[PDB]
Amino acid sequence: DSLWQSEDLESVVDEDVQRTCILHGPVASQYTSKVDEPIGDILNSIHEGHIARLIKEEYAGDESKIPVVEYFGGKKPASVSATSVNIIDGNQVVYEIDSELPNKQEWLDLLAGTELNWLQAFISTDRIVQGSKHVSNPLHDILTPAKHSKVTIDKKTKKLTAFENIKGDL
Amino acid sequence: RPFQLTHGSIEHTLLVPNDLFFNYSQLKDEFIKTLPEPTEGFAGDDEPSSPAELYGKFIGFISNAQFPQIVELSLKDFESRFLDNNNDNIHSFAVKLLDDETYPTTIAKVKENIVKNYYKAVKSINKVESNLLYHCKHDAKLVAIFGGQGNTDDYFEELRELYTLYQGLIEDLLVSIAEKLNQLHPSFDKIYTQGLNILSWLKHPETTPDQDYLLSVPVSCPVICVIQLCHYTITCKVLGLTPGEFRNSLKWSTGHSQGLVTAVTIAASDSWDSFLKNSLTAVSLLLFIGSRCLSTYPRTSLPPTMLQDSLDNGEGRPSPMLSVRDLSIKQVEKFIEQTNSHLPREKHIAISLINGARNLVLSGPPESLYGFNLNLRNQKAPMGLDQSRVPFSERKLKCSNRFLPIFAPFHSHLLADATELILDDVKEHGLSFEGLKIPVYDTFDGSDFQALKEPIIDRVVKLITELPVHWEEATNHKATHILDFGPGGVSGLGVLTHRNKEGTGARIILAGTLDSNPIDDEYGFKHEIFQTSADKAIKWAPDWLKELRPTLVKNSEGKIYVKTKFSQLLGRAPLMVAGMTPTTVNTDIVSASLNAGYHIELAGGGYFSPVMMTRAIDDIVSRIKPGYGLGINLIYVNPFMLQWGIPLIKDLREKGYPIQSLTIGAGVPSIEVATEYIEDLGLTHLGLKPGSVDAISQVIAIAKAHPTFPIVLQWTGGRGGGHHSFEDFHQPIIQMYSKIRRCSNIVLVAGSGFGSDEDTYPYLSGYWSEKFNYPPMPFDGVLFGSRVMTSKESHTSLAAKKLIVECKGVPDQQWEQTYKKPTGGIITVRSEMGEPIHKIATRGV
Ligand SMILES: Cc1cc2nc3c(=O)[nH]c(=O)nc-3n(C[C@H](O)[C@H](O)[C@H](O)COP(=O)(O)O)c2cc1C
């Protein structure tokens, strides 16, 4: 237990740094030249440095070429890659279901669609924040395929509507 | 009326025309009596084990019978029943037959009696296929490479089986070649009396002499040329493309030590007769090279003592070539001059050929090379020495050096006297090559043969014998697909030139063997060249300059972020902060930084009871912006921490706190322990940082067992950590990076001494392998531990922060000499457990 004394120097003998031990890296030390600066600003410096270099290596100093996405993240570190055949949307879309075309994951992706929009994020995400409380996504449970049901995402994903044949009526 | 073939437990039903069932039946009576009796699961090499193979033996048996009008109808029925929309792509169907579980997985029962009989019974294949793969010139490029001498020990059965299966596509070719071979044979007698009749040897295997005679350069040179000629002719014939117009589909071509003759002959050919004539001239030259390279420097009897001692030390049978691996060129050249300081100029050892930065081959008399490897064994260390416990900077050089299967000291001064005689033979016969069409890159200079004042043959003979091989200078490619028609297959030039071009967008397609598919799909096989699909016919290689290159993105509020394979999971910068027991236990260093939008994990070493962890996590969550999550850095060495932390994480995740990551500290856990981590307690990714090559293998094993859950590797190279596992930051991953990336769910980030954009960008982009002569090797992210200690948020004492500031750094290659002196104010000291610790050099330290 010789690790905390560097943190709390006011406690040790006569507040002498040379008596305490600080764990640090020989390779990263030359990069540490500023003192008492925000960690956010440090990671910034690195982030916009990468911005600048990555622009000035292939984007020819133009940020318009950058492929802007609506929300950054979600389905895996790679670019979102579900079953590409079933990654589809459309203006007038209704999804008839049977026993031939159910399966949990592919149905969820089929409902999600292609564009990284609000609906795709809402359906695809594996977690919902409840006042800073990561819980399971309820869409996964409630959008489970059911016999003789129907999902309508008409008008370019403005709204999803799921129907089931209650008392023999959809 | 349907016709049903039965054999053992397998039957095949086909709809034959009515007024043939009589004479279609007579063949059947003759087919059942030619096949072996069933034995324990169709295990006979001649025995069918699939309906397609059974019908293929039917269609091949009917070919030896003089009875037309059925053979082509049967071929069409086979194509319709088994080859849907790929009727001229049987190579894909054969290798897909392997993936079936009913068929016992083996290549012997697939390649022959399916592909052999198909092309034995096929009509003229002069049908131009969907050759749109090269039609996009700016997107696809084809380069033909040709192997050299000694790619394999038993090269002869390559040509044996190629004649065995592709007799119909090479029958008019090999007879014509061997006719010239036997015409030119008598002028070079008394040196190989056992004959040079390939046709008699292939038709009668008992006429073929021993492999000691066969593997000799004078015999193997014409045979290797015939091998590559047959491979190219089969390549042009299966697609039904004229070689003159198939050459148009190629951008440029070059070859190995021996293969340059084929590389330049490949463009002198326009028609089938012209290609035959040029092959006839080429095969004649190789007879002269083999004859005069043996008469100029005849290999004499070698005592059994030296070869026995070389074999007992793990080497090969001594040869004019000594291949040394795993050392740089500047080291090999340093050692060879020391070795030759005790040798004359007649036995001198000089750089002969360079397969890479860490694979060279030296040339000289066998006793001189055995004197070289005696020294190298004195300088080296065993494989089982366990280099992990002594620092890398002061370990011993590791190598595996042995001799190649070639019987002539090529690419040195020794054959420099032979060249003047060799060119004389060129003048003695009609050895001449007409105008070059595709550029051919020089093996030594790297230039084109078109802009030459001197002829071609008289200079390639100088190149093969005297000029050294700078192999990578010749193959400075600008292309996507590389096709090897030469010997070796998996044991030849193709794999070692793939290793030099792993991420440069080069897709290696093996035309020598057809036994796809490898478990990693590093390289393709014969089927890929002949695929006729529009966009599915081309398998693209990992282009790690563009594929895993970072991109960017703009926000709706006007701010810009980085799009990578770590940032996308993070939804933020691909720049994490590692968990530190002193540093990252402050609620403020984690909370006040997450509000900025960057990823940090809390180290559990600064907390000693679950109530303290819960009180810290609750405080961080209460002040961060709602929706962000935090990681937890755990430590594996102490079981107490594990047993009070793992239950805490499980039920805090069941509650639903933003606990987001679990970085396990030093010591990669077992598969069973990591099993419940991944499945039961519900995280997004698992931080599982290793510290050794064995640990990296263990984490890859952990990644295989769970091919759904992301695993951030976080491989630290022990350069800047607290408990630095002392290893190089490059070597443990330079050899196993493309053993990690065979994972749909692996994440690879790197730490150990990162502080700024300039030193981290090469690792993300992948250009960090340029100094080590490797393809671009991108990293998903980079973790920072020592550069954020001087941050405002950190509660480390301001005076210690100052001491760090005036504490200077260490250049990378010197980091490991921190065991003696205050290298940049930082030394390594032993812990109470024996683990090395980096500490600021102070009076206490
Ligand atoms: C003060 C300090 C404490 C650290 N504590 C831990 C730890 O408890 N567990 C661990 O796995 N790594 C620990 N590390 C190592 C970091 O996790 C990281 O791997 C290392 O700092 C390499 O990055 P760097 O070169 O920028 O320091 C510590 C590093 C420092 C500087």
Q: Give the angle subtended at the CA of B802 by the CAs of B796 and B808, to the nearest 5°.
A: 115
For residue B276, give how far its alpha carbon lies from the nearest alpha carbon of chain A (Å): 47
Residue owning tokens 């006839």:
B280
CA distances from B723 to A6, B453, B716, B843 (A): 16, 64, 10, 20
B591 is catalytic: no
How far apart CA B114 and CA A162 sit, in angstroms, is 52
Beta carbon of B716 within 6 Å of any ligand 1 atom = yes
Long-range interactions of B79-86: CB distance < 8 A, separation 24+:
B81/B14, B82/B52, B86/B531, B86/B532, B86/B533
Cβ neighbours of residue B281 closer than 8 Å, sequence gap 6 or more: B265, B430, B431, B432, B433
Given a contact cutoff of 8 angstroms between Cβ atoms, the answer to whether B582 and A3 are in contact is yes
Helix ranges, B188-271 (H) = 198-203, 211-214, 217-238, 243-246, 260-268
Tell me whether residue A77 is exposed, middle or buried, using C-beta atoms within 10 angstroms of its C-beta: 0 to 12, 13 to 18, 19 or more. buried
Length of chain A: 170
Given a contact cutoff of 8 angstroms between Cβ atoms, the answer to whether B63 and B121 are in contact is yes
Cβ neighbours of residue B613 closer than 8 Å, sequence gap 6 or more: B604, B607, B645, B648
In chain B, what residues touch A18 (CB-CB under 8 Å)? 842-844
How far apart CA B494 and CA B259 sit, in angstroms, is 13
A19–B842: do the CB atoms touch at under 8 Å? yes
How far apart CA B688 and CA B666 sit, in angstroms, is 9
Of residues B598, B755, B818, nearest to A31 (C-beta): B755
- Terminal alpha carbon distance of chain B: 94
For residue B784, give how far its alpha carbon lies from the nearest alpha carbon of chain A (Å): 9
Breaks (C-N over 2.5 A) in chain A follow: none
Cβ neighbours of residue B331 closer than 8 Å, sequence gap 6 or more: B397
How far apart CA A130 and CA A141 sit, in angstroms, is 17
Tokens read off for B679: 């499945």
How far apart CA B748 and CA B203 sit, in angstroms, is 55
Residue owning tokens 């008409």:
A154
Beta carbon of B784 within 6 Å of any ligand 1 atom = yes
Beta carbon of B583 within 6 Å of any ligand 1 atom = yes
Breaks (C-N over 2.5 A) in chain B follow: none
How far apart CA B336 and CA B332 sit, in angstroms, is 6
* B747 Cβ under 8 Å from any chain A Cβ: yes
- C-beta atoms surrounding B335 within 10 Å: 18
Task: Give helix B217-238 / helix B272-296 axis angle, nearest 10°.
Answer: 160
Long-range interactions of B262-265: CB distance < 8 A, separation 24+:
B262/B146, B262/B225, B262/B228, B262/B229, B262/B232, B262/B485, B263/B144, B263/B145, B263/B146, B263/B440, B264/B433, B264/B436, B264/B440, B264/B449, B264/B456, B264/B460, B265/B433
CB contact residues (below 8 A), chain A span 6-25, against chain B: 6-10, 15, 17-25
In chain B, what residues touch A14 (CB-CB under 8 Å)? none
* 3-class state of residue B372 by DSSP: helix
Q: Give the angle subtended at the CA of B33 by the CAs of B27 and B37, to the nearest 5°.
A: 135
How far apart CA B682 and CA B442 sit, in angstroms, is 58
Q: Please list the residues that pair with B553 across neighbouring strands.
A: B561
Helix ranges, B113-192 (H) = 116-121, 156-165, 167-184
Of residues A20, A29, A133, nearest to B809 (C-beta): A29
Phi-psi region of B277 (alpha: psi -120 to 50; beta: other; left: phi over 0): alpha
Helix ranges, B380-442 (H) = 418-428
Given a contact cutoff of 8 angstroms between Cβ atoms, the answer to whether B684 and B569 are in contact is yes
DSSP 8-state symbol, A80: P
Closest-CA residue to B826 (of B812, B809, B843, B844): B809
How far apart CA B602 and CA B768 sit, in angstroms, is 30
* 3-class state of residue B633 by DSSP: strand
How far apart CA B398 and CA B388 sit, in angstroms, is 13
For residue B809, give how far its alpha carbon lies from the nearest alpha carbon of chain A (Å): 4
Closest-CA residue to A47 (of B558, B764, B430): B764
Given a contact cutoff of 8 angstroms between Cβ atoms, the answer to whether B208 and B163 are in contact is no
How far apart CA B482 and CA B524 sit, in angstroms, is 10
